[PDB]
Amino acid sequence: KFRRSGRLVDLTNYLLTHPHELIPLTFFSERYESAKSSISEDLTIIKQTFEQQGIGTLLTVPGAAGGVKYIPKMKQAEAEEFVQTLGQSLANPERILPGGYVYLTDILGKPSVLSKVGKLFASVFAEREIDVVMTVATKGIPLAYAAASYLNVPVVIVRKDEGSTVSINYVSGSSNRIQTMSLAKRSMKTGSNVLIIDDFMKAGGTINGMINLLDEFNANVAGIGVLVEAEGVDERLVDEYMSLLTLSTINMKEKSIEIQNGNFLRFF
Amino acid sequence: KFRRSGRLVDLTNYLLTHPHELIPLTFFSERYESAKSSISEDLTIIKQTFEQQGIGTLLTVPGAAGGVKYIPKMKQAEAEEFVQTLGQSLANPERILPGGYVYLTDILGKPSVLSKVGKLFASVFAEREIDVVMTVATKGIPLAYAAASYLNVPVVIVRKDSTVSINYVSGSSNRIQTMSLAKRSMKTGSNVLIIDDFMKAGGTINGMINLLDEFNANVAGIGVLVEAEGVDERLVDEYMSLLTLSTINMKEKSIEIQNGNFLRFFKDN
Ligand SMILES: O=P(O)(O)OC[C@H]1C[C@H](OP(=O)(O)OP(=O)(O)O)[C@@H](O)[C@H]1O
Ligand SMILES: O=P(O)(O)OC[C@H]1C[C@H](OP(=O)(O)OP(=O)(O)O)[C@@H](O)[C@H]1O
Numbered sequence: 001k002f003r004r005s006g007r008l009v010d011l012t013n014y015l016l017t018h019p020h021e022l023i024p025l026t027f028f029s030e031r032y033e034s035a036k037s038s039i040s041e042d043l044t045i046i047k048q049t050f051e052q053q054g055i056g057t058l059l060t061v062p063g064a065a066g067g068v069k070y071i072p073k074m075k076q077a078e079a080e081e082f083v084q085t086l087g088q089s090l091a092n093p094e095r096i097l098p099g100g101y102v103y104l105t106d107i108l109g110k111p112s113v114l115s116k117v118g119k120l121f122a123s124v125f126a127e128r129e130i131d132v133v134m135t136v137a138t139k140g141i142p143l144a145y146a147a148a149s150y151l152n153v154p155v156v157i158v159r160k161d162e163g164s165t166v167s168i169n170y171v172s173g174s175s176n177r178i179q180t181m182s183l184a185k186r187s188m189k190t191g192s193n194v195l196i197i198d199d200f201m202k203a204g205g206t207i208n209g210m211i212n213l214l215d216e217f218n219a220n221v222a223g224i225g226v227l228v229e230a231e232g233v234d235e236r237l238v239d240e241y242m243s244l245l246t247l248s249t250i251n252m253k254e255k256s257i258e259i260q261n262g263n264f265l266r267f268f
Numbered sequence: 269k270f271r272r273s274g275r276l277v278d279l280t281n282y283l284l285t286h287p288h289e290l291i292p293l294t295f296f297s298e299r300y301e302s303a304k305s306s307i308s309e310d311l312t313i314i315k316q317t318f319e320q321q322g323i324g325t326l327l328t329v330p331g332a333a334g335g336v337k338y339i340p341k342m343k344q345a346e347a348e349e350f351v352q353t354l355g356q357s358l359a360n361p362e363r364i365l366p367g368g369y370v371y372l373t374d375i376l377g378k379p380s381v382l383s384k385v386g387k388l389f390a391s392v393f394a395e396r397e398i399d400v401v402m403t404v405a406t407k408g409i410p411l412a413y414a415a416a417s418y419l420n421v422p423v424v425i426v427r428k429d430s431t432v433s434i435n436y437v438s439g440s441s442n443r444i445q446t447m448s449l450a451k452r453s454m455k456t457g458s459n460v461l462i463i464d465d466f467m468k469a470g471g472t473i474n475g476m477i478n479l480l481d482e483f484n485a486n487v488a489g490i491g492v493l494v495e496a497e498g499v500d501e502r503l504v505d506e507y508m509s510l511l512t513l514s515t516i517n518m519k520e521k522s523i524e525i526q527n528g529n530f531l532r533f534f535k536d537n
Contacts, residue, residue: 005276005313006316006317008273009276009280009314009317009318010321012276012277012280012281013321017383045273045277046277049270049274049281052274055281105450105453109422109425111416111417111420111421111422137405138406138409138427141409141410142409142413142423146413148377149379149382149383149414152380153379154377155377156377157377157409162367162368163365184371184373186371186373187373
């Protein structure tokens with residue numbers, strides 16, 4: 001039958017494991033063998049706690065098609081504190097790599113770090129219509145998956161090497177050599193709304209390549225998120241995008257590195 | 269502060285997002301401004317609900333400096349059901365391609381699937397000592413992360429391109445490849461859960477195991493989503509598989525999928 005206590009625990013779990021899914025009140029009412037109106041009072045308690053604790057919000061549709069949807073959201077204050085902490089650990093001279101690159105590998109491997117970044121991306125882009133999260137192998141993948149797990153959409157990975165395939169030449173900052181990115185035609189429907197995620201935007205050719213690839217699929221750019229941007233990305237290369245951090249100054253020989261907030265506050 | 273109701277909700281959230289961490293009772297007492305004995309009653313309700321709903325195990329560690337640890341677990345019944353359903357999705361004729369053969373890419377990218385497989389892997393290897401999850405680029409990276417997030421460990425991604433390199437041969441290829449890992453990317457002595465999406469002939473996983481030897485690392489376990497039939501002498505190291513793939517077109521427009529060996533990992537010797 002479920003006591004009120006067990007009901008709150010189970011509902012909390014159920015909502016948290018089914019983010020961005022509209023769940024009919026009748027599903028819970030049958031699950032708990034309780035009246036829908038009692039479920040709604042339970043949802044009011046979870047909503048309040050979710051909001052007070054910075055977990056997210058519950059959106060409800062009343063009436064005959066009645067249902068509830070859990071939206072992961074991050075409060076501005078948590079976002080700023082988290083990005084600040086991340087930037088401070090990035091501001092380490094030992095992470096400087098040749099070519100104005102920054103060592104992110106340890107950071108991109110940690111579960112706690114990834115889930116906060118994923119959540120921040122899902123929070124900012126929560127209201128966009130997004131069908132799919134896309135990135136290019138290899139380093140962006142963890143970020144793209146983390147974001148996708150909160151938005152509850154597929155992650156699509158563009159390859160650097162099946163079935164029929166769409167291909168796009170592009171240049172990345174790591175070599176003036178022309179590279180090719182490709183995605184199988186079945187990997188994505190025409191007209192998909194696509195969130196592009198990546199770890200580091202240096203000169204913007206990679207994200208621009210992904211934008212050109214979507215153009216071939218007749219898919220739409222719903223949004224763009226990167227963990228770190230270098231200063232001075234050509235605006236023609238990349239449209240609107242959100243960055244968490246800015247690599248504002250780097251110098252291998254001086255072994256000097258400076259990092260600032262990205263533009264993420266514009267999105268709050 | 270918190271009414272008790274909000275406390276049950278927040279606590280549930282906190283445990284779920286902090287799997288495989290010992291959380292001292294004092295942490296919760298201070299967080300909710302409530303007595304430890306009141307928190308213990310809440311945790312008893314969560315523990316009982318977590319078990320009945322197949323969410324996992326809430327472990328109590330007794331003592332003045334004790335607390336609780338939430339362990340994600342999946343019941344055998346759900347694992348069996350999940351693997352059957354997944355196997356049936358895999359058998360869809362529309363996944364047959366000329367050449368390579370079976371399109372698995374959407375499955376490897378779907379969060380509902382990834383969350384389930386990750387939890388299954390985490391539940392089976394829950395009691396092993398695991399410092400890190402390891403995989404090779406590219407398609408199975410999300411899977412590695414899903415498993416790692418329930419186990420609460422970092423993921424290390426081996427690259428196909430000081431750095432440690434070893435040669436090996438791939439089942440979906442006909443040439444010697446190289447896999448590599450920076451020494452600064454993984455600690456020596458680590459206990460390692462290797463995760464792989466599709467094991468053909470076993471060269472990749474054996475490459476990984478060889479790599480681990482250069483770091484004096486231990487193979488704590490191996491999980492693969494799908495294995496091809498015909499691992500004769502297989503590979504030196506036991507692994508768990510969910511599904512087995514064979515005859516990729518007989519009669520016409522058909523694919524043969526069977527359950528893997530995962531059930532061995534749910535029973536006692
Ligand atoms: O000048 P740009 O086009 O901005 O190039 C920046 C690179 C860096 C990043 O590394 P990954 O490709 O994620 O990782 P790896 O190259 O190691 O696979 C990739 O996504 C490109 O965006
Ligand atoms: O077991 P083997 O005999 O080595 O052959 C199977 C290979 C193929 C597969 O490559 P992926 O990394 O999944 O392919 P991609 O790089 O396209 O993701 C990987 O899982 C290896 O197990």
